[PDB]
Design a protein around this ligand. Sequence first.
Ligand SMILES: O=c1[nH]c(=O)c2nn[nH]c2[nH]1
Ligand SMILES: O=c1[nH]c(=O)c2nn[nH]c2[nH]1
Ligand SMILES: O=c1[nH]c(=O)c2nn[nH]c2[nH]1
Ligand SMILES: O=c1[nH]c(=O)c2nn[nH]c2[nH]1
Ligand code: NA
Ligand code: NA
Ligand code: NA
Ligand code: NA
Lengths: 295, 295, 295, 295
Amino acid sequence: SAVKAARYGKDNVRVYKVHKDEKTGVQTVYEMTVCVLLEGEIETSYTKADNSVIVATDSIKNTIYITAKQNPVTPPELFGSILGTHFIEKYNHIHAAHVNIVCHRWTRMDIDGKPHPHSFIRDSEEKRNVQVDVVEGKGIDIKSSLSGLTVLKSTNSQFWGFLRDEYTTLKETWDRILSTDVDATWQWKNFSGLQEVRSHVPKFDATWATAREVTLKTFAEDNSASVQATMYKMAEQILARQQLIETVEYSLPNKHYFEIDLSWHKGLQNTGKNAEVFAPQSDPNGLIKCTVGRS
Amino acid sequence: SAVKAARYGKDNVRVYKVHKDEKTGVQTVYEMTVCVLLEGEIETSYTKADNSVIVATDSIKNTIYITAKQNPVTPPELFGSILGTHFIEKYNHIHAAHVNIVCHRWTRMDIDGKPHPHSFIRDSEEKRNVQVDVVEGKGIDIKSSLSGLTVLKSTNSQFWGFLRDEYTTLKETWDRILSTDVDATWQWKNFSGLQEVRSHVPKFDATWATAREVTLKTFAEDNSASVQATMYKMAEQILARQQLIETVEYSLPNKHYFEIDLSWHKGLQNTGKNAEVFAPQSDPNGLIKCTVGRS
Amino acid sequence: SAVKAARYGKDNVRVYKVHKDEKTGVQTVYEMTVCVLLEGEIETSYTKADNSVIVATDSIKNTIYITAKQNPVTPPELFGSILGTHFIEKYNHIHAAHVNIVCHRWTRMDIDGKPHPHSFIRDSEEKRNVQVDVVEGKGIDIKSSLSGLTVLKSTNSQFWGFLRDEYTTLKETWDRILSTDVDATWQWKNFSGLQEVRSHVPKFDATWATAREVTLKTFAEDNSASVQATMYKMAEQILARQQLIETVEYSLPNKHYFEIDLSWHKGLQNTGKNAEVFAPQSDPNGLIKCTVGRS
Amino acid sequence: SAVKAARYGKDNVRVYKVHKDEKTGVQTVYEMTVCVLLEGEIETSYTKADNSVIVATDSIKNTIYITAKQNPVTPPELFGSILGTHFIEKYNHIHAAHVNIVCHRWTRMDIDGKPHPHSFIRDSEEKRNVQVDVVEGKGIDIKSSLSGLTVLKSTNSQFWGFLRDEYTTLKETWDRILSTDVDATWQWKNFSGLQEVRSHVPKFDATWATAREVTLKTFAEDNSASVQATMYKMAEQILARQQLIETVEYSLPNKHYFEIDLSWHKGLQNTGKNAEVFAPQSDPNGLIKCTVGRS
Ligand SMILES: O=c1[nH]c(=O)c2nn[nH]c2[nH]1
Ligand SMILES: O=c1[nH]c(=O)c2nn[nH]c2[nH]1
Ligand SMILES: O=c1[nH]c(=O)c2nn[nH]c2[nH]1
Ligand SMILES: O=c1[nH]c(=O)c2nn[nH]c2[nH]1
Ligand code: NA
Ligand code: NA
Ligand code: NA
Ligand code: NA
């Protein structure tokens, strides 16, 4: 038997960092969960019990804290790159570092109109994520994403004209509820190393904001012919607004809300144009995925 | 053996309802999860296999939909009362109805500044809840609550002067992080029946808003001596702003963020006034509860 | 405003303890999650910021470890009593201690037939729990329970003869699937203090085993007329086998499995006696509760 | 912009099936959750709103039930292959089907020694899974797996000899707790189509049993030098017992249990050879992965 692939490291490392403006008194908090997996010349730890090659996962966790102490943690694309680079540069036999960061929302509270200097609210379970792969000799590949953005529209969605055969019961509709949890990922051009990543720093936050804004507007305004068709329009627009993105991926559940026929009770009318009360379905759900790139 | 207590019904009933303003085109959605448990003269279903006394839980679920079709679903205190009353009035042998409602957030999207007519976002996992107990002959007892409101402040919290003995390692502090998930419940004066509940309808939304506003402001502005002391101030204020509330309860986890000593590494300074990077603790946690009433 | 009730302490305290037989080499592990809430003369911490009355929740966590180091952790009824007693005896102004313990399963692995000396498997998410309330002057009240015991039977369940009215669609049946998650609690006679609890130590494990065995046998063998009727039979039997139990409570979800009509496709027969493929329903669910005591 | 990749279908489809031996009365239940994603000539649904190409996800769900009604559901490798084949054969423009199945445990109850004909228990959250990819012209690729198998050993684990530098605090140890949740996947030789899969049917259950048995024995008996070293031994053995497997993958969390120093309290000794009470750590955790194949 031989080792075809191997990676190891530390998952679920929770990190908070506070920044304090001494002049204004204003504090800003960042909270993340970080995963670091390493690859390289480590096969012998598996095959021969040779621990000499292992940077202990405990040490990986120490590094994460130390790096956050000494460096900016924002934007996460820059923090991830700095953290992954550190491991391939420091250890000769480590040749790749895979860094996943989930950013949690701590949104500044407004109190009596005005923004509070040191109080925050978790206004949503929506996450901003990054996957940074740092590979010795082959640069830095960044995938940036948003996830857990849960939306619903009550009308201006349709689904008609699909294939009908002997497995089909679904009825065509010109007016339905559409609700989803948005997972959207935008993949950056390969970067040559940390200097190139630093040179693009203003573009990471700006592109995350564009992505989120495009997803929201498009969902709200599209008179949607299908999830497929609506998601395409989102992906097309992002690609057009940021030239350094190579691909946009979307993965969208279709969270069904069913009509409830009440006509068995006193002829009550609650279907078609008379539908007011609906039953949210926990499962199953439609799952629609696309990766869009440049022609 | 004898039946000392018994209740039964339907849990986890998901309900969506849409309202459509035909004049303006504006739609408003409500989504809840509802639980109904009934009590009464039903012992024989347990002891003698006498199903004749059972209003089937399937039928309870039908009623929930029918009631939402025929009545307002907002505020949930009114919907809960209408639903519980229905069961004690309709069935001679049913003498109590326990209605729990969890309201989920569907917040109107703003798109290019302005509010969208039929698009919504789940801006937080915070819930508005009600427990309505409708007891034949003894009126309607409403407990209203908010839960899942997650907040954090980075400074202006202290914890010093506590009992020190041979079980104590904790150090006194004059500056720490305080973070919690707010569970707050306000209990209404007993209402004589549905007419009285209807007569107070404007007060339910207004009091939920006051409670939430007081919780937020107090947390942000209090230079906190303890969770205990901060929560008291919240409860006192709510009681003072709404005379029809008899008790306010708060249940607050103290979600700890620990300092990380990095001085073993190159003498790095990350404690006391030098603390910037902290480790959020998933468990254990402090759990602090209070019920406050009138003198 | 006044403090009507208050309690505080430490939740989610994870504890593992190993016992080592030096003679045989055999090790035995115990893992729990523990919650301790205290009450007493502590109002001033809330009203006057007087921390002098607070045994810090951090100290409560230290005590839990120390107590487990110095005392048996099994059965949990004895450990809970020892832990709660400690707080009311040690602190003059603390008058009640509420101890909740969840026991997690670490079941000895069998390897090539025979039991391994130091290897364990988590063979189920079923928990054994205790709630111990230790109140100064009024003894020790123990509620013991099992939870998360998930069972299913494919036949020998019926549900017919229920109330039918204009809210009823459910059809009567003489053969259905019954599946539930068993929550069962048995409440002990008040104990005068720790000496009395110690004198009953062999009865705690034996009664948990009886309860579990009765729940299982009764569920399997009863030709069930309803959840109500089946649960009664379980509760009756437990009360009869253990005289020191005052009440048995059961709380049982009815986790529905629906028939799927496939006859629209090639006249396929999958209902009534032809039902083979069914759709498990995640929600809603029936929720049936009983408390049974002595005549 | 262009569509680089696209897939769509139905997730979270819960399926139960019962088999009834009419001669013996013995019933056997199977419960799964199934996901089907399709690919093919469907780009126009995204780019041109052309729904004519879409087999509705609702129809995919119907097919799943119909297929389970007409075919065995066990072993899941055979069911998955039959289901994926159906879609590529039935629809000219569909060229790939990706079928994921999670099998849930319904273990026959033993009652008074002997196996009950129609009563089952969920004895563990451990799953048996399959991923079947059916690609028109390129056969059937099956990955089989177990997951959620949670184990712990209290001794006979070591971790010493690792790299020590200025990021290292971890101490070397010759005796620690090792606990993990086993995710193990074995990947089959490509199969030419359904006839070949059918010809190997007895090997799927037998290999799942071998894998599980090897994982268990190896974990229990290995005097472990590291997670890395122990997992290698498991993977090597599986490959040696089943020639039709091309690769074995393992992904193992290292769920840490920390020593608790109590010596600050009355000099209590709870470290090194005196360790009895430990603190389970919820996060972070070590994450160790390997893919092993043939030389
Ligand atoms: O938007 C949709 N896309 C689909 O592919 C589909 N299938 N059923 N319903 C659907 N809705
Ligand atoms: O606010 C606090 N209240 C408490 O009771 C406590 N105990 N430890 N830390 C604490 N913080
Ligand atoms: O066992 C049952 N008890 C009930 O009360 C009920 N209601 N619907 N189905 C039911 N099944
Ligand atoms: O088994 C281990 N493998 C590792 O790589 C490691 N790192 N810290 N502890 C460890 N234990
Ligand atoms: Na390197
Ligand atoms: Na009545
Ligand atoms: Na006392
Ligand atoms: Na095809």
